[PDB]
Amino acid sequence: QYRVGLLRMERAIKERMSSVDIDTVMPHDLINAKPAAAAVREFFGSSQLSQF
DNA sequence: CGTCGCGACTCAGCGACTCTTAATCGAAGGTTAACACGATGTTTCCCGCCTGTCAAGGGGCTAAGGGC
């Protein structure tokens, strides 16, 4: 599930890096963190394996 | 005196609704251009009309006490 979240984050970073230039760019400014923690939250929030 | 030109034929094949009956505990995670007038509501007081106090005054009715 973290690999799925990382694939989503990679898609987001690929969609966002085309707009923001890489030369003189603020570090880690295009990498998102919502789908990273959202995947583990769903895994521990309402997953069938983490049900109880 | 054979077949094939030309026709149906039923056979396959492909899609598709339910999972008893009561019950063991409540919610549940992300997606990230910038600005501008305008017309459109939102929210405060402010007087208008009116509603509700208790009081003041009084009289009128009821009743109780005293005298013949």
Swiss-Prot record:
Self-association state and partner proteins as the record states: The RNAP catalytic core consists of 2 alpha, 1 beta, 1 beta' and 1 omega subunit. When a sigma factor is associated with the core the holoenzyme is formed, which can initiate transcription.
Similarity field: Belongs to the RNA polymerase beta chain family.
Role, per record: DNA-dependent RNA polymerase catalyzes the transcription of DNA into RNA using the four ribonucleoside triphosphates as substrates.
Gene that specifies this protein: rpoB
Portion of the parent chain present: 471 to 522 of 1356
Domain of life: Bacteria
Protein's recorded name: DNA-directed RNA polymerase subunit beta
Organism of provenance: Caulobacter vibrioides (strain NA1000 / CB15N) (Caulobacter crescentus)
